[PDB]
Swiss-Prot record, chain B:
GO terms for cellular component: ribonucleoprotein complex; ribosome. GO terms for molecular function: rRNA binding; structural constituent of ribosome. Gene3D superfamilies: Ribosomal protein S20. Belongs to the bacterial ribosomal protein bS20 family. Binds directly to 16S ribosomal RNA. The keyword tRNA processing does not apply. Keywords: Ribonucleoprotein, Ribosomal protein, RNA-binding, rRNA-binding. This is Small ribosomal subunit protein bS20.
UniProtKB/Swiss-Prot annotation, chain C:
This is Small ribosomal subunit protein uS12. Belongs to the universal ribosomal protein uS12 family. It comes from Mycoplasma pneumoniae (strain ATCC 29342 / M129 / Subtype 1). With S4 and S5 plays an important role in translational accuracy. Part of the 30S ribosomal subunit. Contacts proteins S8 and S17. May interact with IF1 in the 30S initiation complex. Disulfide bonds: none annotated. The lineage of its organism: Bacteria, Bacillati, Mycoplasmatota, Mycoplasmoidales, Mycoplasmoidaceae.
UniProtKB/Swiss-Prot annotation, chain D:
One of the primary rRNA binding proteins, it binds directly to 16S rRNA where it nucleates assembly of the body of the 30S subunit. CDD domains: S4 (cd00165). Residues 95-156 form the S4 RNA-binding domain. GO terms for cellular component: small ribosomal subunit. SMART domains: Ribosomal_S4, S4. Gene3D superfamilies: Ribosomal Protein S4 Delta 41, Chain A, domain 1 (1.10.1050.10), RNA-binding S4 domain (3.10.290.10). Pfam families: Ribosomal_S4, S4. Part of the 30S ribosomal subunit. Contacts protein S5. The interaction surface between S4 and S5 is involved in control of translational fidelity. This is Small ribosomal subunit protein uS4. One of its GO terms (biological process) is ribosomal small subunit biogenesis. NCBIfam families: PRK05327.1, rpsD_bact. One of its GO terms (molecular function) is structural constituent of ribosome.
From Swiss-Prot, chain E:
Belongs to the TRAFAC class translation factor GTPase superfamily. Classic translation factor GTPase family. EF-G/EF-2 subfamily. It comes from Mycoplasma pneumoniae (strain ATCC 29342 / M129 / Subtype 1). This is Elongation factor G. Catalyzes the GTP-dependent ribosomal translocation step during translation elongation. During this step, the ribosome changes from the pre-translocational (PRE) to the post-translocational (POST) state as the newly formed A-site-bound peptidyl-tRNA and P-site-bound deacylated tRNA move to the P and E sites, respectively. Catalyzes the coordinated movement of the two tRNA molecules, the mRNA and conformational changes in the ribosome. The gene is fusA. It is found in: Cytoplasm. Signal peptide: none annotated.
Length: 80, 77, 67, 203, 276
RNA sequence: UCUGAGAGUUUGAUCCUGGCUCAGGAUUAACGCUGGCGGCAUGCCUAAUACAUGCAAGUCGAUCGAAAGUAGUAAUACUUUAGAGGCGAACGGGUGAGUAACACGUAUCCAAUCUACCUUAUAAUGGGGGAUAACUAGUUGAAAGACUAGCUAAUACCGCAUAAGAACUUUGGUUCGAAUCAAAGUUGAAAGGACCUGCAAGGGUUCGUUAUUUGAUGAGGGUGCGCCAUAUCAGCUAGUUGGUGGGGUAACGGCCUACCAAGGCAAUGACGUGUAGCUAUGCUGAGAAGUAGAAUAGCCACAAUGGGACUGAGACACGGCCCAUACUCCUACGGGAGGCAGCAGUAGGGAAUUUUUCACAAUGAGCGAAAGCUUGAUGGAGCAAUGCCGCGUGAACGAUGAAGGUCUUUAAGAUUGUAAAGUUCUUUUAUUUGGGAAGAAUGACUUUAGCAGGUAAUGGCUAGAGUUUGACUGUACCAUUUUGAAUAAGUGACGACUAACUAUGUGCCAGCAGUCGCGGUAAUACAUAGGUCGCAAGCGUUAUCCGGAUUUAUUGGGCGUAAAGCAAGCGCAGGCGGAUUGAAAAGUCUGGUGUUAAAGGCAGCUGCUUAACAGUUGUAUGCAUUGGAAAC
């Protein structure tokens, strides 16, 4: 969490396996206000497809908001 | 102090003993190659280099380079 | 703490200087003498500061009068 | 200060009332004199326009009741927006919470308005407030937080309150709305714009 | 009135630390943490009654004085004596204007030897061994009329002063003054400065640096300039006159003799005789 | 939309140039004066000085032995890991000393690169062998432990066989010192879990095994460019310069070696000295620009000091090793142990910086199928006004100015002052009571439907349900919640610059002083008290930077006498330079393209009562490159 103290914030950051937080990133997915949980956030909807194209499995915790988005519905064709 | 480090410290020591044993085995094989040149010993040393580049003991690029030099110098015939 | 030694005017009435009492020198300006370029500070040292000053209250040992 | 502890010394030094007579009430032979003891056949030796700068800045400083750090901060806030910034400066100063609620007829004076706001006697559109900093915009409805409607002092003050044409007020339900921005001639313009912009020597 | 933070419990021994998480009631232990501590404190966390158990606390008897050898050393003795006073409530240390040095107190010599060992090994003090010194009063014989005298040119017009006054010492009444000028030979504004030239010397001595007390006077004669004037000249001349008066008439000190109520069960009273 | 304020000072008076000082902010600022609180951020710039304890890294029992233990007659259900082996421990932290450069930043070629775990997809998982940790016995010992022998397990390791594809080689087709294509000489890989199904023998689910290609990620090299000062640092350097041979190397290269050859750089400032982590950026200014390199971020580099090495993709490694140096500690005097520029913390220095604190709640990283575990990463609270910011010290009426104090030097008065008193209101803060947050439903787990290679089940993918994660918090916040104005403001100045004058003492003294400089008988300049003013829980105030200081001048200066034209000349390099018309487009302008991270400011907005703050869209040149332009 960053930003104003006592006010959590969590940008959806990019990391393959070994990029520590608050540093270099390949692409910014968007933002998130983790105070009122409704998945209200702007995303490219193609940058996640960018990860899905060449691996670098996404972080396991931001998975729920993408389930609300539904990335499997456009990801199931990864192995067909 | 630290405990797994000591386990790791003694873990690779035996590994290193075995690996240097096979490395000097390759060394004496390529020394026999140096003494006089034949097809059979060159094939044997290539077969050994295949295993050694196969493992992490020897870099694949170094093995490829050395085998290229050896075939280059034997093709003088 | 360095080897160089500087001269300094003594503001305030009387003096709490007692033949090698610790002092704390501070940037100052006195045009009456070539060699004085600093001042002693009153209010925090072995010198507890002095009264009879309330128009000026900070650059001295002057408390607020007890009243 | 928020409560300077003495207002007539300062006013008799300057000479500005609230509307026409509030700093004087025939209290001790109502007169136009300084509170000092240098006589009153003369005022001072040095004369400068910066003295008028100080007089106007104190008059605007205290007749709406702000501090000085907030003062420069809000000049910056208005500096954000372009145009004739002086009139915007004054209209934003008028837009302050205590200023508006006073202009609502809801407060005997700005000090009283800040006091009633401080102890939680105001509430608008589910927005409580304890800081006199609300900027009033068209579309704001202001309520009294009628839990404390038992107070007879507020209703007595609103009996003879001053009405403003650019807003709307109600005399009995303690409610109002901010219809429009403040106007130049409708308000005391003793503060001269050129002098105010003259004082701005920060940058 | 402080909520203290407790780090851990432990058992001290000369070898090393020995810590145990809990201890039952009625036992003894040591606590690391508890940012400030002194003897006989009561600590409450179970929200129970606080309590005190102290029926004796020794007071010091001996007073010794030690001079410093370095200014930072002096500050370090002050700090170290404060620390030892906090460590054990048995003795008090003073740096008073009566002596202007370190006034220590304790029981015996070997306790002081241990203290100097501590402040040498840890506190870096190089304490010396000396003898105590106490303040004394200082009176003086009944001298005759004295005169204050001064010419010095001081930045422009010369500064002049002549005074002729008498000091009659007596412990019945203090500083007096009688207007004994009938013609008006002296201005009234000169009445005060000469008196001032006395006050600066009412609490110090020129021979031993100890207060000269019971100083009476009366302005009897004097001399200034016609076309020139001076005000503090009177005070400076009076100070010089005080020095001159002290020079001539053999002042004598006055020492505080103490009452001692010595006790013994009539066994070591031989010490009492052979010493007293 | 952007675009610059003066004042004072040499003189009998009066002008040029010119310095100095103030009016403006800003700080990782002490310390006075102190002081109520809410958030808001920060808190060794100083000895890269040495340091106790807890924390700073573990994890796999669904890979195994092996002993041990709770319940078990027994078989063992289960426990748990000292141990082997598996992964990781190099990532994460802080420091900035040495480094003056390919360190950094930018554009780059890597026809010289490599990258385990992911990525699409491919090839297979046959067996064989024997040690050994642990355990046991002993010597040596409190321990340390070493040396023998016996006992084994495993995805540990070593052959055999087998190769899709790979390397290696030869022929045949390709590009603006190389690459692809068919054929073949040589050669090599391994393993078992867990479950289902099947009497079985097999088969399937899934981890992993061994191989391959797309990628990306990561690291490294060269290149052009820009990126301190110094002439009281004039010549400097010899694996140095060049190639060959050979070697080493993820990899190109005197990277290294042998053979010889003889340079290489330089006045366009090399070499050497002081000094510096760099950059983005912070501050200031109207800008050009100047100062600094705080927090925060990226790159590099270090790790008590100097070297040398192994490990694995990956290190020459804060807490992996060896040696030496230096220091500390223990000891049985036999011998060893140790590395806070990890967190706190200590000791010293230092004017100047905190907790010998808590939860892993969320998220990050490592392990694991999962129960989850580890985490001073992370987030909290503690201290500090250190800075920006809000907020208490009350509010309406109430007087010919209550007491006092001061002057009126003569005696209404004037003054602090409607502030006092008094009427009454109210609780920001302080008090009673109750309710009570969110952040935390993320997360796996426990149950269904469809989906699909595979039907025989077991597996997963989502739509739905339930299980919980809280140090925070007793918080935020709310409530016809109760006594109660009750719980309180300092602060420098008052001659002029800049604003507000009287009096006591004062007598070139005490003194005061940003500048002008005042003070010896009437001080508005000193102390004193009243009053007056300016800021404000801060005000004093020097170290600190720019602006004014156009006070080293592209913007934006001068040299006749105020400072300066050399004593003059022959002039190399260099700068500038007649007209005409031609190519071309180097400078230059201009239109697209890649890039110029995050963050800051600017504009628009969202959230907290309100800004400070955070988040969000654009916002920042410039470098390379495609196309026009030919005026100079």
């Amino acid at each position: 969490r960053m930003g104003r103290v006592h006010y959590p914030t969590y940008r959806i950051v990019a990391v393959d396996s070994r990029v520590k937080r608050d540093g270099k990133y390949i692409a910014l997915i968007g933002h998130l206000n983790p105070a009122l949980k409704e998945n209200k956030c702007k995303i490219d909807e193609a940058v996640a497809l960018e990860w899905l194209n060449k691996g670098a499995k996404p972080t396991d915790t931001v998975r729920s908001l993408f389930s609300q988005t539904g990335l499997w519905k456009k990801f199931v064709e990864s192995k067909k | 102090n630290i405990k797994s480090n000591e386990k790791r410290l003694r873990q690779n020591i035996k590994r290193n003993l075995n690996n240097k044993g096979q490395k000097t085995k390759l060394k004496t094989n390529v020394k026999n190659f140096h003494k006089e040149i034949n097809l059979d010993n060159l094939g044997n040393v290539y077969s050994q280099a295949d295993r050694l580049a196969r493992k992490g003991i020897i870099s694949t690029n170094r093995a490829r380079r050395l085998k290229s030099r050896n075939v280059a110098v034997l093709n003088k015939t | 703490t360095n080897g160089f030694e500087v001269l300094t005017y003594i503001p305030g009435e009387g003096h709490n200087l007692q033949e090698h009492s610790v002092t704390l020198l501070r940037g100052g300006r006195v045009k009456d003498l070539p060699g004085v370029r600093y001042h002693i500070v009153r209010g925090t040292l072995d010198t507890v500061g002095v009264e009879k000053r309330r128009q000026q209250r900070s650059a001295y040992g002057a408390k607020k009068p007890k009243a | 200060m928020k409560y300077t502890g003495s207002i007539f010394k300062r006013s008799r030094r300057l000479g500005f009332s609230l509307l026409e007579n509030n700093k004087e009430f025939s209290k001790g032979k109502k007169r136009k004199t300084i509170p000092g003891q240098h006589g009153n056949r003369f005022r001072s030796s040095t004369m400068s326009g910066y003295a008028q700068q100080l007089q106007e800045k104190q008059r605007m400083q205290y007749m709406y009741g702000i501090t000085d750090k907030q003062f420069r901060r809000l000049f910056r806030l208005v500096l954000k927006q372009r145009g004739n910034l002086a009139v915007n400066l004054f209209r934003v100063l008028e837009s302050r919470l205590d200023n508006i609620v006073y202009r609502m007829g809801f407060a005997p004076t700005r000090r009283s308005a800040r006091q009633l706001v401080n102890h939680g006697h105001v509430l608008l559109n589910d927005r409580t407030v304890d800081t006199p900093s609300i900027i009033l915009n068209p579309g704001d409805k202001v309520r009294l937080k009628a839990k404390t409607i038992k107070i007879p002092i507020v209703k007595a003050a609103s009996e003879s309150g001053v009405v403003s044409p650019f807003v709307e007020t109600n005399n009995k339900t303690f409610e109002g709305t901010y219809v429009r921005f403040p106007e130049r001639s409708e308000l005391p313009a003793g503060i001269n714009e050129s002098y105010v912009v003259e004082w701005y020597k920060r940058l | 009135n402080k909520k203290e933070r407790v780090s851990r419990l432990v058992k001290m021994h000369a070898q090393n630390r020995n810590e145990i998480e809990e201890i039952r009631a009625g036992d003894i232990c040591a606590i690391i943490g508890l940012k400030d501590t002194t003897t006989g404190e009561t600590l409450v966390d179970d929200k129970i009654d606080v309590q005190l158990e102290a029926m004796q606390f020794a007071q010091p008897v001996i007073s010794l004085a030690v001079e410093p050898k370095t200014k930072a050393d002096q500050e370090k003795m002050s700090i170290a004596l404060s620390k030892l006073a906090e460590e054990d409530p048995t003795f008090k240390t003073f740096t008073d204007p009566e002596t202007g040095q370190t006034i220590i107190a304790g029981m015996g010599e070997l306790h002081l030897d241990i203290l100097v060992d501590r402040m040498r090994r840890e506190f870096k003090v190089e304490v010396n061994v000396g003898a105590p010194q106490v303040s004394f009063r200082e009176t003086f014989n009944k001298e005759s009329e004295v005169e204050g005298k001064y010419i010095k040119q001081s930045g422009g017009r010369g500064q002049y002063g002549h005074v002729k006054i008498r000091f009659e010492p007596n412990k019945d009444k203090g500083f007096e003054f009688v207007d004994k000028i009938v013609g008006g030979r002296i201005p009234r504004e000169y009445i005060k400065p000469v008196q001032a030239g006395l006050e600066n010397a009412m609490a110090s001595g020129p021979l031993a640096g100890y207060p000269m007390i019971d100083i009476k006077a009366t302005l009897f004669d004097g001399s200034f300039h016609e076309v020139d004037s001076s005000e503090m000249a009177f005070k400076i001349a009076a100070s010089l006159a005080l020095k001159e008066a002290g020079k001539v008439c053999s002042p004598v000190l006055l020492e505080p003799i103490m009452a001692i109520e010595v006790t013994v069960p009539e066994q070591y009273f031989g010490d009492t005789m052979g010493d007293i």
